[PDB]
Amino acid sequence: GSHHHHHHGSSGENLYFQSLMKDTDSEEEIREAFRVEDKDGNGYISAAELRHVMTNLGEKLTDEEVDEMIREADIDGDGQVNYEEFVQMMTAK
Ligand SMILES: [Ca+2]
Numbered sequence: 001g002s003h004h005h006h007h008h009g010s011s012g013e014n015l016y017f018q019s020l021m022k023d024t025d026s027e028e029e030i031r032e033a034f035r036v037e038d039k040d041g042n043g044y045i046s047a048a049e050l051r052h053v054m055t056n057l058g059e060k061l062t063d064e065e066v067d068e069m070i071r072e073a074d075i076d077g078d079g080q081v082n083y084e085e086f087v088q089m090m091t092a093k
């Protein structure tokens with residue numbers, strides 16, 4: 001009803017990816033979230049931790065999707081998200 005149209009369609013829907021990098025409550029919440037996601041205090045967000053955020057939102061992606069998602073989302077293609085990159089990834093545009 002309110003949300004549907006799950007068809008791939010011919011539309012690029014590229015702007016969809018930008019939506020993820022957008023939509024934020026408060027800069028403070030993002031900073032705190034990093035700590036919560038950094039349970040190992042490694043100072044880095046891994047797929048496991050990255051999924052925690054997606055799962056919390058109710059979004060469920062496959063194992064292959066996460067790998068490709070992170071790689072495509074990772075600007076430095078380092079396979080890992082850094083603090084400086086994390087903040088920007090959320091504060092992007
Ligand atoms: Ca961590």
Ligand SMILES: [Ca+2]
Pocket residue numbers: 074075076077078079080081082085
């Ligand atoms: Ca990175």
